């Protein structure tokens, strides 16, 4: 039997199978406690639990696709949707440090230590995987993954104990203490292997193709319009007909989508109580851009997220500025004009999406509370689904010697750490590209850069990512 | 070309610390046995006498 490190995407006219492999490292915990919290806010505080476990977060898109493979994805296909996912934990080498006392560290190898692996197929434990935090994976396959520690927030009971105003969320009857050691635990010793084998639900595709037409300009530019438009107001209408030059008063049969607090340049847009509780709903809905290119510069929005760096790394949503969205887009009403910045849902509407890019998420989670709309596509990129890919928790073990009969001899957790290899494969159901009788060469697919500093390549940790994000809508539909 | 890296086994950590050398130190010895066959032709004829 052959032991392999697998990596690489294989394309077809149908789905592409993209696998990657990293080296993980379950470090250590000198205390295997649970370590509740002590936040004690003073102005609704938080209340958590710090589990001694390690989950892994392969959420982003820049791990399954190389930049050459992402460029081959954009210039050849016109949709993408995942349908399968397997996570194999390869060769495990749990080892122990012997503390040379004069050298400090000497690492032998342990055959009796193990690595407790739990897969949460039943969704019993809280899901913290898809929120966009700075522990995902290395972008390049040569660096070592350090998987994050598992922790979660619960709901408790806010008290007010202190001197001035000190609040503290204590435990209530609704609060929960999920001990992960009440489960089934593939114990997974040295050399052991384990798999997950998830299967994605039917999700709508992401349509990696722009438009060569405005949605409000879909008419014959000649010929006028069969209908009329008012001239006088005040009870005596006196409607007139239209010519072909009436472009700003052409009647549309479909409205644009909502623009709830789209502005340009804290908390952004925010719900909450009077002025100071005020939790943020930062990257808007998915129907809104937060960065595009107007006639002179880049407009950058209040509701933007930076994706790195600062100056920021924002995706250029040029396909939302086209179809009647954008940042400083007011709506006007002739009520006895009222400039409004919020646009409502407007029963017949189309708002296409905020575009996915090379570094976006893949799923988040739709929360278990009911009556969702629309929630098929989450913000921060990705899909977002009921029953997401389950979390793979990885503790090592507390091997706890020696004793000597009465004594607390030694360290009693001796010291152990585990290295390994995680090979994650995911298949994406690709759709065929939309037809164009176009005759023009379509624009080329290359990541954006400015001058001299090229995109993904080593320079004199070396490897540098571009200033703008590499979006995915660069071929035209033609609507 | 037959490329041969070893691996970057990268311990220990201790939970937060950058303990040790983190590439610990490793080296690999081995044996490469390379066989090659050469299609030989027969020697050209000479009625030479020398």
């Amino acid at each position, epitope marked *: 039997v052959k032991s392999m490190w697998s990596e690489g995407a294989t394309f077809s006219a149908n789905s592409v199978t993209c696998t990657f492999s990293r080296q993980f490292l379950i470090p*250590y915990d*000198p205390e295997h406690h649970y*370590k509740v919290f*002590s*936040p*004690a*806010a*003073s*102005s609704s*505080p938080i209340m958590g639990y*710090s589990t001694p476990w390690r989950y892994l977060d392969f959420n982003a898109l820049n791990l399954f696709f190389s930049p050459l493979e992402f460029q081959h994805l954009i210039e050849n296909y016109g949709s993408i949707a995942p349908d399968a996912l397997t996570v194999t934990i390869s060769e495990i080498a749990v080892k122990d440090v012997t*503390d040379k*006392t004069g050298g*400090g560290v000497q690492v032998t190898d342990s055959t009796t230590g193990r690595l407790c692996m739990l897969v949460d197929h039943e969704y019993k434990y809280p899901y913290v995987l898809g929120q966009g935090q*700075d522990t995902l994976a290395p972008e390049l396959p040569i660096w070592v993954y350090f998987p994050p*520690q598992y922790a979660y927030l619960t709901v408790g009971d806010v008290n007010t104990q*202190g*001197i*001035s105003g*000190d609040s503290k969320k204590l435990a209530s009857e609704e609060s929960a203490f999920y001990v992960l050691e009440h489960s089934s635990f593939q114990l997974l010793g040295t050399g052991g292997t384990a798999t997950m084998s998830y299967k994605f639900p039917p999700v709508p595709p992401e349509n990696l193709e722009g438009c060569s037409q405005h949605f409000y300009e879909m008419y014959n530019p000649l010929y006028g319009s069969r209908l009329g438009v008012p001239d006088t107001l005040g009870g005596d209408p006196k409607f007139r007909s239209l010519t072909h030059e009436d472009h700003a008063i052409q009647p549309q049969n479909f409205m644009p989508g909502p623009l709830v607090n789209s502005v340009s340049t804290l908390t952004g847009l925010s719900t909450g109580t009077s002025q100071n509780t005020r939790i943020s709903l930062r990257p808007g809905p998915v129907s809104q851009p937060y960065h595009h290119w107007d006639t002179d510069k880049y407009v950058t929005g209040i509701n933007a997220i930076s994706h790195g760096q600062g100056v920021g790394r924002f995706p250029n949503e040029k396909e939302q500025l086209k179809q009647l969205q954008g940042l400083n887009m007011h709506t006007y009403f002739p009520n006895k004009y009222t400039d409004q910045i919020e646009r409502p849902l407007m029963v017949g509407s189309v708002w296409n999406r905020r575009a996915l890019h090379y570094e976006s998420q893949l799923w988040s989670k739709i929360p278990n509370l009911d009556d969702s709309f629309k929630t098929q596509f989450a913000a921060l990129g990705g899909w977002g689904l009921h029953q997401p890919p389950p979390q793979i928790f990885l503790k090592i073990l507390p091997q706890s010697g020696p004793i000597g009969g009465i004594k607390s001899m030694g*360290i009693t957790t001796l010291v152990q750490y585990a290295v390994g290899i995680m090979t994650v494969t995911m298949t994406f159901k690709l759709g065929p590209r939309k037809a164009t009788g176009r005759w023009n060469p379509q624009p080329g697919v290359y990541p954006p850069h400015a001058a001299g500093h090229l995109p993904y390549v080593l320079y004199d940790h070396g490897y540098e990512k571009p200033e703008e994000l590499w979006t995915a809508k660069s071929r035209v539909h033609p609507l | 070309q037959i490329f041969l890296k070893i691996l970057p086994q990268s311990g220990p950590i*201790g*939970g*937060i*610390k950058s303990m040790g050398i983190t590439t610990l130190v490793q080296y690999a010895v081995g044996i490469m046995t390379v066989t090659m066959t050469f299609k030989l032709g027969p020697r050209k004829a000479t009625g030479r006498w020398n």
Partner: antibody
Amino acid sequence: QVQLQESGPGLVRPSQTLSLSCTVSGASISSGGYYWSWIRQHPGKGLEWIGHIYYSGTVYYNPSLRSRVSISIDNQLSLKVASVTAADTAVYYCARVRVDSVRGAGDNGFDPWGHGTLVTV
Amino acid sequence: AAALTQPLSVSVSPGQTAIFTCSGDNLGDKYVYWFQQRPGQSPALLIYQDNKRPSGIPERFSGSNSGNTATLTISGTQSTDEADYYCQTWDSTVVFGGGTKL
């Protein structure tokens, strides 16, 4: 450069609210991740830590001085230690720590300190 | 740990070293920070993360953290290092040490 200047009221013995303040110069305090500590030092003895506060209201306290002191932020970094029947006057420093990444162990230490005020009790 | 141990004072001459002890339970898997407090002045961050020094601190200060102790070694002590040195860790709140009076 970032400097921290204190404010001392003087001396009040018969159990009044000891109020302090620490205006930060060089950089604003609601500009990112930095704790803002209050640290004591008894003359002839080691340092003592009261508590630190983030700009979004969350404040950690010392478990020994928990029900006496109160840290607050109105771009002022106040401290309202009451019940001064125990005559602790020592010294009151301000200090800033960069907020760590993993929340487990402290990745940074108190690099910018204050000048220190001498309260008497 | 939650209670750092540190002796009272040390005695040194110019031309040698003075190594202090900051004892503590499981201090090897922790960060220890050293603070230089000259008399009449606020402390300054001397050695952070058990080995590193900032730009304002000269290159004669170095420390270590192994096992249940963390030392601070001064290489070539001058006539201006007579200052209280405190070790400080983070046992989930903050833990300050006693101080070796030099």
